[PDB]
Design an enzyme around this catalytic site. Structure first.
Site, PDB file in Angstrom:
ATOM      1  N   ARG A  24      35.855  36.656  39.712  1.00  0.00           N
ATOM      2  CA  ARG A  24      36.924  35.727  40.057  1.00  0.00           C
ATOM      3  C   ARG A  24      36.416  34.640  41.000  1.00  0.00           C
ATOM      4  O   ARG A  24      36.806  33.477  40.893  1.00  0.00           O
ATOM      5  CB  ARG A  24      38.089  36.477  40.706  1.00  0.00           C
ATOM      6  CG  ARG A  24      38.551  37.688  39.914  1.00  0.00           C
ATOM      7  CD  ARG A  24      39.910  38.179  40.387  1.00  0.00           C
ATOM      8  NE  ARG A  24      39.798  39.101  41.514  1.00  0.00           N
ATOM      9  CZ  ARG A  24      39.326  40.338  41.407  1.00  0.00           C
ATOM     10  NH1 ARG A  24      38.925  40.798  40.230  1.00  0.00           N
ATOM     11  NH2 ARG A  24      39.255  41.117  42.479  1.00  0.00           N
ATOM     12  N   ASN A  42      43.106  40.627  37.553  1.00  0.00           N
ATOM     13  CA  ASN A  42      42.886  41.715  36.608  1.00  0.00           C
ATOM     14  C   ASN A  42      44.160  42.531  36.413  1.00  0.00           C
ATOM     15  O   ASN A  42      45.144  42.349  37.130  1.00  0.00           O
ATOM     16  CB  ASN A  42      41.755  42.622  37.097  1.00  0.00           C
ATOM     17  CG  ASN A  42      42.156  43.446  38.305  1.00  0.00           C
ATOM     18  OD1 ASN A  42      42.940  44.389  38.196  1.00  0.00           O
ATOM     19  ND2 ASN A  42      41.618  43.092  39.466  1.00  0.00           N
TER      20      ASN A  42
END
Length: 99
Positions: A24, A42
């Protein structure tokens, strides 16, 4: 100059082992190169619901950066899109990661 200001918003859940890793941090970085917004996070299934908000001129390339490309840690065995949306203004101003 050239014309083509088509702002849209498409969200999808990339597959592959992209859960439990540190991608990320880079997912939001690459978004700055082109100038797109959205969010990354997620799930508890084994995927990542990522959205690509911005001009199609860039999205057309960003769609491959997450589909084909990604990160050295996580992996992408397959990916697909849901349904883009033609908007006049982006709900977001800058790309950010969700905690």
């Amino acid at each position: 100059g050239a014309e083509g200001n088509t702002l849209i918003s498409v969200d999808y859940e990339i597959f592959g082992k992209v859960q439990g890793v540190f991608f990320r941090k880079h997912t939001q970085a690459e978004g700055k190169k082109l100038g797109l917004v959205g969010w990354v996070q997620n799930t508890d299934r084994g995927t990542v619901q990522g959205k690509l908000q911005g001009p199609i001129s860039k999205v057309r390339e960003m769609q491959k950066w997450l589909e084909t490309r990604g990160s050295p840690e996580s992996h992408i065995d397959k990916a697909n899109f849901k349904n883009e949306k033609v908007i006049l203004k982006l709900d977001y101003s800058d790309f950010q990661i969700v905690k």
